[PDB]
């Protein structure tokens, strides 16, 4: 095509194709589910290993005591954006002596991701991020995209085969506000389990958990730490 080379070139229907290729790169990545209770925010990320002799790829990135990030898509672009927002939190703690509010932070994330979509010859950062945060008004699950659009969600799922998890979160949406932390993590585990094929189930090796909220720093549970949370999960009904 003639209009899928550069982000500054406009289609007759009014669409920019290269940004859509960036979201297709986001869809290429594995699935993660961000879901919040009245007091907690949990990211359940499905880790992937390139081989049996290779470890699982890290997907949950802790940033601050109130903020953690799960990724989907390109890992290096996620690292760059994540370090930029890390030093943003560092600047907020340095100058203001307060944790940075999550909403203005993700507004700045959209502000930065606005610029590669308007300049010639430059690509958007091909990664979509689910954001678990806490501030004075409560916990937050946010999502940001390479199209510089950020959305606040009670629950969200992104990555490969995330539609089943989105259906599961939509079917139980009134319960997450009243579910406790264990029930929230179990619901997120079942949602990420809905993304999985019928021949593979949740293991300790491929699940990362990131929790933030009251009386709780953003803690990442990996491997054996996932094992208590896998306990109590019901089997798949036929």
């Amino acid at each position: 095509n003639q209009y899928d080379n550069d982000v500054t070139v406009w289609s007759p229907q009014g669409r920019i194709h290269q940004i859509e290729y960036a979201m297709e790169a986001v869809k290429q990545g594995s699935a993660t589910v961000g879901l919040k209770s009245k007091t907690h925010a949990v990211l359940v990320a499905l880790k992937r290993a390139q081989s049996e002799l290779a470890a699982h790829q890290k997907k949950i990135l802790h940033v601050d005591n109130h903020i953690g990030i799960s990724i989907a898509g390109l890992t290096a672009d996620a690292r760059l954006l994540c370090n930029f927002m890390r030093q943003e939190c560092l600047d907020s703690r340095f100058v203001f002596d307060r944790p940075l509010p999550v909403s203005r932070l993700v507004s700045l994330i959209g502000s930065k991701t606005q610029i590669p979509t308007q300049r010639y010859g430059r690509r958007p950062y091909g990664v979509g991020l689910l954001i678990a945060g806490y501030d004075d008004m409560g916990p937050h699950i946010f999502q940001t995209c390479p199209s510089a659009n950020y959305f606040d969600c009670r629950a969200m799922s992104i990555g490969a085969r995330s539609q089943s998890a989105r259906t599961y979160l939509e079917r139980h949406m009134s319960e997450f506000m009243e579910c406790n932390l264990n029930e929230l993590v179990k619901h997120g585990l079942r949602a990420l389990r809905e993304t999985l094929p019928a021949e593979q189930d949740l293991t300790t090796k491929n699940v990362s958990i990131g929790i933030v909220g009251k009386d709780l720093e953003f803690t990442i549970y990996d491997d054996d730490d996932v094992s208590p949370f896998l306990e109590g999960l019901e089997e798949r009904p036929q």
Binding site: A148, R154, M173
Partner: protein
């Protein structure tokens, strides 16, 4: 022809810029936002399409606070709209830091017009995909309201409509005895017009974003409170039966 429709820095053989028209079309497939200036303020109403039920209330906001007396109404890509809102906020801050008083809305509209169209001269940058409306109140200038498109042209308006249903809402605005009638029924008629122009068949159920500026807040732009919003919603729904 080939090559005339790739850059904003090239003309058509007729003398047109195809990228600006594609920005117009990227405006024209967005949701309907209207804004009416009356005798004592400027009231904006935005149709917010709820594409997913997972989004929280307060997501995808198209009403912005440019300044403590200046309110904002956009339709198009939300990223370009937010960037231009930040540009207008920085220009208002610069005006306050250089001059020490409230910025006239004609001045700020000119500045954002200059910053929108300055990217339509080059192949290295693309035109914005969002049309928008600036509305302000002051005691000396009264209420004022301006329309700026991605071509960077600012026009004064008494009331205007942009988005997918700009023509129907414009004709609905044309039917109002308007220069004498108060904001408190401006908002109700905005709700009625927005609910009329929304097509329930081809679009999902939406939210009625609403805001004003004027004498009732001493020239301060604010979002419409809950009871007034649901009152305008009930008036609009009772006008549809």
């Amino acid at each position: 022809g080939t090559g005339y429709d790739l850059s904003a820095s090239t003309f058509s053989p007729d003398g047109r810029v195809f990228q600006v028209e594609y920005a117009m079309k990227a405006v024209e497939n967005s949701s309907t936002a209207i804004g009416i200036r009356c005798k004592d303020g400027v009231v904006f109403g935005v149709e917010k399409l709820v594409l997913s039920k997972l989004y929280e209330e307060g997501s995808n906001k198209r009403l912005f606070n440019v300044d403590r007396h200046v309110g904002m109404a956009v339709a198009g890509l939300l990223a370009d709209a937010r960037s231009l809102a930040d540009i207008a906020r920085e220009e208002a801050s610069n005006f306050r830091s250089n001059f020490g008083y409230n910025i006239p809305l004609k001045h700020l509209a000119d500045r954002v017009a200059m910053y929108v169209h300055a990217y339509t001269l080059y192949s290295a940058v693309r035109p914005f995909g969002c049309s928008f409306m600036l509305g302000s109140y002051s005691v000396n200038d009264g209420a004022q309201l301006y329309m700026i498109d991605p071509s960077g042209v600012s026009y004064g308006y008494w009331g205007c409509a942009i988005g997918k249903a700009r023509q129907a809402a414009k004709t609905e605005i044309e039917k109002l005895q308007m220069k004498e009638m108060t904001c408190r029924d401006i908002v109700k008629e905005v709700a009625k017009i927005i609910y009329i122009v929304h097509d329930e068949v081809k679009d999902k159920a939406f939210e009625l974003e609403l805001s004003w500026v004027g004498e009732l807040t001493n020239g301060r732009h604010e979002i419409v409170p809950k009871d007034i919003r649901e009152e305008a919603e009930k008036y609009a729904k009772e006008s549809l039966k």
